[PDB]
Amino acid sequence: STGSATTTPIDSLDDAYITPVQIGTPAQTLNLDFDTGSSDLWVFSSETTASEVDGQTIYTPSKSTTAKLLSGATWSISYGDGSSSSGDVYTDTVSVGGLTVTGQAVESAKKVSSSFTEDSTIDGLLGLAFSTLNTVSPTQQKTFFDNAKASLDSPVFTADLGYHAPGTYNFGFIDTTAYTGSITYTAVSTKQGFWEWTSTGYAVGSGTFKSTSIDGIADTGTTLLYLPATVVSAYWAQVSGAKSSSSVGGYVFPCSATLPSFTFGVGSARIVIPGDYIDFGPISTGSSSCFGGIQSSAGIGINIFGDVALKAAFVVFNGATTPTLGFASK
């Protein structure tokens, strides 16, 4: 089997991407944030504290003839950005782009933090990291991909995120029309539960490539590119007037700037992030200070190849017995 679903930016900055997901019988379609940096499929629901719901579409398990309470199971998750959610668990039928999994754990939120409430466009998350990170207790649950894998034509999914445009998540096949040139594959460590890999270096604009190993995670659920302070300083030094602002929470730059590109290495291959992808717009409405899309990972504890990086590539998440990651230009 295979599946193919379009993923759509939630706003004009590509802050996140939503993908429609069918849950239950009859189908309830929710727009979920597919997150290769976590491993829980959780939804706003009829159980979510009413004051914490503001415009989201909810899953109502009592209206699904295939829903079953997973008795005694609870979940609770905290994300890198400080947001969180928790609740109980149902199993139900879940379909993505025509690919159906029966008995998928659907984690129903009883509580969500303010950032989730305030984002009316995201109805929940669909985790695509390794199932070892799943938070369900006392019986850990599998991700949608893990459940689907054996049925797939090939044990892979691909992320093809758009810049200010829709893109695609495919399951079970590689669309050879969706990228240019060849796909370069690189080793993955699953030791921390992430799609963790090592970039071979970087360049700023038309500058020379610096060969240096940068360990990080491919994370579709993180907006920006978080890299070591040395790398990030080298980038922003090429933008007149750019500076790190403790009050704003990262590097800012004059909105009048033209940003240089940023290149990262995948083995001997190179992925080029155009400068425009690095512009996250005014820090507040009407400001002439703009927020940068490349930020320091210092104090996160891990480098993160978030959407800014991934949307410059066609990315293969290869879930074969020994997982690997593939990147192609597009």
UniProtKB/Swiss-Prot annotation:
Residues the record marks as active site: D35, S199
Keyword DNA repair (UniProt): no
Disulfide pairings: C255-C290
Gene coding for it: EAPA
First-to-last residue of the parent protein present: 90 to 419 of 419
Listed name of the protein: Endothiapepsin
GO MF term list: aspartic-type endopeptidase activity
Organism: Cryphonectria parasitica
The enzyme's E.C. designation: 3.4.23.22
All residue ranges annotated as the Peptidase A1 domain in the record: 17-328
Enzyme kind, highest EC tier: hydrolase
Family recorded in the similarity comment: Belongs to the peptidase A1 family.
Catalytic reactions on record: Hydrolysis of proteins with specificity similar to that of pepsin A, prefers hydrophobic residues at P1 and P1', but does not cleave 14-Ala-|-Leu-15 in the B chain of insulin or Z-Glu-Tyr. Clots milk
UniProt KW keywords: Aspartyl protease, Disulfide bond, Hydrolase, Protease, Signal, Zymogen
GO BP, sorted A to Z: proteolysis
